[PDB]
Each structure stands twice: as C-alpha cells, then as structure tokens.
Design a binder for this molecule. Sequence first.
Ligand SMILES: [Mg+2]
Ligand SMILES: [Mg+2]
Ligand SMILES: [Mg+2]
Ligand SMILES: [Mg+2]
Lengths: 222, 219
Amino acid sequence: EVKLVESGGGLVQSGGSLRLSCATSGFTFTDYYMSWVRQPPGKALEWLGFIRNKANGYTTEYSPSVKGRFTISRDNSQSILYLQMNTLRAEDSATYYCARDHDGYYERFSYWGQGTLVTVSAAKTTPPSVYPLAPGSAAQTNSMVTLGCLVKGYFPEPVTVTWNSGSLSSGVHTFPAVLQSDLYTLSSSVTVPSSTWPSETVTCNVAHPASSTKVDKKIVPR
Amino acid sequence: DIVMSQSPSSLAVSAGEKVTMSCKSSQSLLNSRTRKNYLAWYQQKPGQSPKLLIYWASTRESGVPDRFTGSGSGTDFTLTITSVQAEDLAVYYCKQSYNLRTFGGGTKLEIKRADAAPTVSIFPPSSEQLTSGGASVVCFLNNFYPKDINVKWKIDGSERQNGVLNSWTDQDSKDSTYSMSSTLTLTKDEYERHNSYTCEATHKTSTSPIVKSFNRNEC
Ligand SMILES: [Mg+2]
Ligand SMILES: [Mg+2]
Ligand SMILES: [Mg+2]
Ligand SMILES: [Mg+2]
C-alpha cells in the first residue's frame, strides 16, 4: 500500500529551525525522486525542491524562494524523507506536503502525504477546551436533532475532530477555526435522528497534536 | 524559472455544465526525445491533499472520470470538465515538470444552485464552560445558498455585536450548499444578568429572518 506520512510540523519561533519527516511505504523508495511542496492557508501550491533517486546520485534542487535556507535529505535505510528548515519567518507558515516524484519519462506516480502544518510564531502552545453543545431544555423541532462541539482557545492549528471515532461522518459540518488574539476557536455540528440520540452515545473526539492532547467529550441531554 | 500562468482565477456553473481552464507556460514543455509534454493537472478538493488527474498533458490517470480531458502542446494547455458534477468543487492547479517543477496559481471551481434557506439551531453555554467564568452562545446556520448570509444576535431583545465570531465552511460537495457558525462569547456574570438570547438569520431566500432563541430559565 503506497503511503506517505509527514510529521514534525507544529509551532516554531521566528529565526528558529525545524525538521519535517516523511515516512514512505508501498514502493521502492530507492529509485524515486521525492519533492516537498508547501501551501500557505488559502494560497497556491509552491514547489520547494526535490532530491533525486540513486540512479541519479540522490542529488538535490531547490526553488529561489528557499535558496540556502532549507535542506532535503533522505535516510535510505529508514526509507524516510526529511526537510530541514532554517531561519524561519511568518511567510513560511503553511502546510508542507511530500510527494513521490520521478521524471515524466516514467508513467506512474501521483502520491502525496496528508501534509503537516508548520506555524511560525512566538505565541504559546495552548490545548483546547472542549465543550458539548446539546439543545436547550427548550422544545426543539424535527425528527432530527443537531448536536455540537465547541473547541475553544487553542494554539497553534490544527485540531482534528471526529464523531464516534469516525463512525459518524454523514451529517458532520466542522467549521474553520477563527483566530482571536493568539487563540483559535472552532465548532463542529452533527445532525442525527431523534430516535438515535440520546438513546445512543454521541461523542466528539478532538486531538491537538502541538500539545499532544486528546479529549473525548460525550454529548448528554438536558 | 518556467512561469505557469492560469486563467481564469475563478469559475462557476450549475452542475452538468461544461467548463475549461487554461494554463500557459513561459517555455515549451514538449520533450524532443520522449515526445511528451510535461504538464500535469491536479485537483485539490477542500481540506484534501492535491490529486493528479492528467499527466503528459492529455493522459488521464487511472480511475479518473472521462469528463476530465486535457489538451494542448508546447506552451498553451487546457483542462476541460465536460459536465461539472457537485463533487468536482475544487481548486485545480497545473504543474510543469519539464525543468524542475512549478505550479500555476490555480483556478477555483464553484457550483451554482437553487437558493436554499438555512436550518438554524441555537445552543446555550454548557454548564462546563460556565464553571470557567465564560459563556459562549452558539448558533449553527446549516446547508444554505447562496453563501451570502447575515446573522444578528439579540440579548433581551437588544442587538449585540461585540464578542461575535463567524465562520463559514467551504461549499458542500454533497449538495453544493454552505453552512456557517456564529459564536457569541460573554462572561458568565454577563450571561446571568440577561435572560433572552436570540439568533436571527436573514437570507435572500426570505425577507423574514429565521429566528431561534431560548430563555435562560426555560423548562
Ligand atoms: Mg450536509
Ligand atoms: Mg487554469
Ligand atoms: Mg511552484
Ligand atoms: Mg449586560
């Protein structure tokens, strides 16, 4: 199974350095070029550079934008790609993706990781407070009931939110986080049949990588 | 530095309609020996990692629907979606790999649809948040269209705007609607000094706001 997982992302201060990693599987890492591409929130994709295969000496090329600041290497034994970032700045805050590259000559590829978010900032890492959103004691309408989860006051992004460990997918709207001062707040709504809640369990699962925190908040009536 | 210029910046059609987008390179991407144009097209759906649809300018990747066609040779290329589907909502990027790699600025594809009123729901602060001395009232405006909407908060019948945060989701790949969240945050003492909390949504779909509310002491 071809899979690429980036990690190492998170919070780093200005002028600081950071090293991202990308674990690959499902193919011969050895003879494949590998690229790093980044994307600032709401912006276009930007190629950063690559590192060629052994058949080509495992050599590297970069874009003028990262000239003498970032470095690409690959631990061929570990079969893992890395990206050393230096003298970072606000403009470097973005999602970094690794991708299996080669050279048009070959026909195949098209593999990217889910990406890791790097936030360059001085603000303090803060875990989220997770609050259940259940209907007021009021008389709600519909054979359907909408529940919620308020994930408040964390930093930096991101947070991952799932319902019943991913089992509840259909009927989920997770709203983009909004920043206030140096803290993010987001919410997620899920709608389910009134005959299923509260007779069945409905739990909001929140993970906050930067602070290594996981919270499961069960939504209970009244 | 091969520059990739994409046009237009954004497009919009109802489902089933056709669209094309252009990508122009500052240098020919045609390889003499291979006879292939090193130009690929990527589809990036909201919140997802990019996905390759077309390579060598016209070869569809395995599994990509036939509605996706690529054309052109040398410097001017075009990606055509013969019949836009709701799930096609995305930002599309072209990328040359003739010399190093470079991405275009992308083209955003939005879907047009029938106006739709939001389904509104309001939530009082949780007992858990009150213990922290805070109190956020949350209102969800789900599945509406167009994206353009207004939310007005009222406490004891008087409008309030300080302490409000609004967030909109990207367009829905299911039904092409939008959803949005509005949070009003107060201090618990603030919250307890009042009794009526209201969330009003005015959408083009009606001159009469969809009103949802609760009283702190309701039964
Ligand atoms: Mg929906
Ligand atoms: Mg274009
Ligand atoms: Mg680029
Ligand atoms: Mg007051």
